[PDB]
Write a protein that binds this ligand. Structure first.
Ligand SMILES: [Mn+2]
Ligand SMILES: [Mn+2]
Ligand SMILES: [Mn+2]
Ligand SMILES: [Mn+2]
Ligand SMILES: [Mn+2]
Ligand SMILES: [Mn+2]
Lengths: 314, 314, 314
C-alpha cells in the first residue's frame, strides 16, 4: 500500500490566505516519517509549484478562475502520474477547489472510481448557483456528468471533463448546505449522510451503508476527499469555514479505518487546514495533529494496535 | 407552520435573577428574523408584562408562590390565545416554572396534547417533596392528574387544573433526579429516557420510541418543553442548574428535527437560559446561539439542507 | 453491597510522582461520605503504608521491581482480607502496577473471577517486550496463566502466581497498544473492545457482549480495573499517559452502571489519577470529580435516580 505524496499549496479557491501552508506544516508534523514508521512505502512527489496568474478578473461573480483552473490542471497532471506509478495519491492541500484536479487525474487512470466526500459542505454549487463566488464550494459541480450543460465556460477550466456520475459519490458530515445545493442533491438522487443521519444511525451503520453503496455491485478504486471542517471545530479549528456540530475525533478515525480496511483506497485528499486561522498556537497543533491522525488511519494505523507477521514472544 | 412568539421574562420560580432577560437576548440574537428567513409565518405576541407581587411570603418552604402562580396564570391566558389563533406557541423563558401555564393554556385548546420534556431534571417535585422550595423543579407535579390529592392549596395556584396524565409525557435527558421524584416516576409508570437510555440505545432509537409512545395510538398535538440544561454545560453553560454528562449539541438538534418532522409540534418552550450566569461573554453567546439553533430546528431548519419547491438549476 | 476501601499510595510502577496522592485527594473529595450517602456499607481499611526500598536497581530495563513487587504483595494481602470479610474491595491508586496485587488477592478468595479492564492501554507488556521499563504497562502479563514461561524471574515478584486465563478478561477503551502487546492480544485470542469497536457498536452493545462474554456460561465475581486514562483527557486530564479519542464521561458512567446492575461487582480498582499533572486547579478537580462519579456509579448511583423502598408520597 504504496503512497505518492503531492503537496498542493493553493488558496485562491477561497479568500483566506494561510491554507497554502498546509503541505508545509503537515510535513513539519512528521507526516511522511510517521507513514514510514508505519507499514508504508512513500515517495514524495514534491510541492507543486503554483505560479502566479496576475491577470485573473472574476467570471461573473466567480473569483480567481484561471488561477483555480490551472492549479487543478497541474495537480490533475501529477496525480495521474502517481497513479500510473502504482501508488495511492496523497494530496496535501490547499483549499478544496483542488478536488477538481485530484479526482480528474485519478479518473484518467481509474475511471471506475467511487468518491467518499467528508465535509460540512457539499461543495456542489455551480457558477450560477454560487452566492459567494469561492471556487472551493464548487468543485463537485465541475466533476459530475449530470451537471453537464449547467456549467458555463469558465476561463481556466476548458480542460475539464466531468468524470463521475451522481451515483458514484457519497457525502458524510453535512451540516451547511445551500438551498440550490440541496435541490441538486435531491434532484440527482445523490447519496448522503448528513449529521442527522450520523446521529440517527451511528457512524458504524453509516460506513456500512457507504461502502456497500459504492462497492456492493463490484469492488472499485476509492477516492477519499477529506475536508477537515467535516470534523468539529473542537478538533480542527484552524480552517476557513468551520461549522459547529461536526464529526468527532473518533468518528473521523472510524471513517478512515474502515476505508483503509477495504483495501481499495486509491486517492486521498487532506484539505482546508489553515494554520494562520488558529486562534492560538495550540489550535494550530490540534488541527495539524488531527489531520495527521486521520491521514495515518487511512494507511493502516489502527487504534486496536498493529504488529508485524513475526513472533513477538521472540 | 405558523408561530406565536410569547416572551416570558420571569425568574421567581428559582433564586438566580438574570433568567428574566432570556426573551431579550434571544430576540437580540435575531431569532424571529432567522425564523422568517426560514419557512416561517411569525407573529410576535410581545413580552408578557409580569408585575411585582411585593407581598409573597413562602408557603411552607415553597418560595414566591403567588408570583409564580399569577405569571403562569397570565402566560396560560396568552398561549390559549395564540393556539386559538391557529399558530404554534413559542414561549421564550424565563425559568421552567412557567411550564405550568404554558401546558395549561395549550391544553385548554388542545386537551389531547402529548408532552416531550427535555431536561436534566424531572421537575416533578411536589410542594411536600421539594427540598429546595424552588417552583421551577415542581411544574410537572402541578400538571398531572394522578398527583391530584397530593398538591396542597398553594396561594397563586387556585386557577390550576391538572391537564395531563402520567402516560402523556416523555422525559429525555435525565441525570439529576431526586429520590421522591424517582419514586413518583416508577409509581405512576412515567416513560423516560435518562442519559443512561440515551447512551444505551442512541438518540435515534430514543426518538423513535418517544414518538411511537406518544403517537402510536393516534396523532395528537405535541408540546415540547425544552430546558436548556438538558444539553451539556459545554453547550449551554449560562443556565442556573447545570449538570455534567448531558445531551450533545448534535443530540439536541436531532431531537428537534425529528419532532419538526412529525408535523405535529403545537407548543414549544425554550427555558432557563440565564446570560448573567455565563462565566464569560463567549459562554453567553454559546448558550444563546445553541438555544437559537434548537429553536430553528423545531421549525424546519434541517442540517441536510432545505430548498423551495422551485427549480434551482433555474 | 458492602465495600472495603484500601488506599494504595504507590507510584514506582511508572516515572511521574504525584500519583501517590490519589487516595488522598479522592478521600478529600468526600468519596466515602458520598458512598455512605448512597446505599452503602463502608469500612475504610486505611492507606497501605508502602515503605521505601532504597536498593532497587533495574532488572534489565525494568525499573523499580522490588518496590513494585512488594507493594503489590502487600496490597494482595489486604484485598484478600477485605474479600474474606465479605466486602467489595475498593483500591484507590496509585499507578496501575498495583493491579497485579489487587487481582492476585481477589482471586485467592475468588479464583473464578472475571476481569473487565477499562484503559487506553492493554498493560500486557512483558519484561522482555516492554520498551519503557515501566511496570504499570506490564501488570496483565504477570497475571495470565498463558504467559507462563515468558515472564523471567524479576526480583520482587517471586510470590506471584498467574491467576487468570486469557479468556477471563475483557478490555474496553483501547487506543494505544504496542505491537508485541497486539501480537499477544491476537495470539491468546483475548477479547477486546478498542475505541474502534465502541465507535462501531456503541457502548450499549459493547457492554452487552462484555457481560455476556464473561457471565454467559455462569455468574462469577467481577474485578473492574479502571484506569482513568481510559476516559478522554477532556474528562481526566490529570493522569500520566493521556491519549486523545477516549471514552466519554457518559460512556464511563454507562460502563459502571451496567456493571453495578450485574450485582456481581467484587473488586474495583480506581487508578492512575495524578493531581500533580493537572495543568490547572480545575484540571485536578475535573479528574478527581470524574473518578468519584465513576466510583459512585459502581455502587448503585444511577442517573435515572434512586429511591428507598418507602412511600415518598408519604
Ligand atoms: Mn467544508
Ligand atoms: Mn470542502
Ligand atoms: Mn433542568
Ligand atoms: Mn427544568
Ligand atoms: Mn492507561
Ligand atoms: Mn493502565
Amino acid at each position: 500500500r504504496t503512497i505518492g505524496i503531492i503537496g498542493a499549496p493553493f488558496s485562491k479557491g477561497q479568500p483566506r490566505g494561510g491554507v497554502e501552508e498546509g503541505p508545509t506544516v503537515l510535513r513539519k508534523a512528521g507526516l511522511l516519517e510517521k507513514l514510514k514508521e508505519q507499514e508504508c512505502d512513500v515517495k514524495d512527489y514534491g510541492d507543486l509549484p503554483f505560479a502566479d496568474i496576475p491577470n485573473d478578473s472574476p467570471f461573473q461573480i466567480v473569483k480567481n478562475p484561471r488561477s483555480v483552473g490551472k492549479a487543478s490542471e497541474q495537480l490533475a497532471g501529477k496525480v495521474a502520474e502517481v497513479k500510473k506509478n502504482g501508488r495511492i495519491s496523497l494530496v496535501l492541500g490547499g483549499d478544496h477547489s483542488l478536488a477538481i484536479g485530484s479526482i480528474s487525474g485519478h479518473a484518467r487512470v481509474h475511471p471506475d472510481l467511487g468518491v467518499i466526500w467528508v465535509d460540512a459542505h457539499t461543495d456542489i454549487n455551480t457558477p450560477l448557483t454560487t452566492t459567494s463566488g469561492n471556487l472551493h464550494g464548487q468543485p463537485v459541480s465541475f466533476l459530475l456528468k449530470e451537471l453537464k450543460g449547467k456549467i458555463p465556460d469558465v476561463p481556466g477550466f476548458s480542460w475539464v471533463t466531468p468524470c463521475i456520475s451522481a451515483k458514484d459519490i457519497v457525502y458524510i458530515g453535512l451540516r451547511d448546505v445551500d438551498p440550490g445545493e440541496h435541490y441538486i442533491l435531491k434532484t440527482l438522487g445523490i447519496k448522503y449522510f448528513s449529521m442527522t443521519e450520523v446521529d440517527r444511525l451511528g457512524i458504524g451503520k453509516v460506513m456500512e451503508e457507504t461502502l456497500s453503496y459504492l462497492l456492493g455491485r463490484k469492488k472499485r478504486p476509492i477516492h477519499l476527499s477529506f475536508d477537515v471542517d467535516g470534523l468539529d471545530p473542537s478538533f480542527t479549528p484552524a480552517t476557513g469555514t468551520p461549522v459547529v456540530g461536526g464529526l468527532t475525533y473518533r468518528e473521523g478515525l472510524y471513517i478512515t479505518e474502515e476505508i483503509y480496511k477495504t483495501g481499495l483506497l486509491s486517492g486521498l485528499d487532506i484539505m482546508e487546514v489553515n494554520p494562520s486561522l488558529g486562534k492560538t498556537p495550540e489550535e494550530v497543533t490540534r488541527t495539524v495533529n488531527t489531520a495527521v491522525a486521520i491521514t495515518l488511519a487511512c494507511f493502516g494505523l489502527a487504534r486496536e494496535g498493529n504488529h508485524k507477521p513475526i513472533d513477538y514472544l521472540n
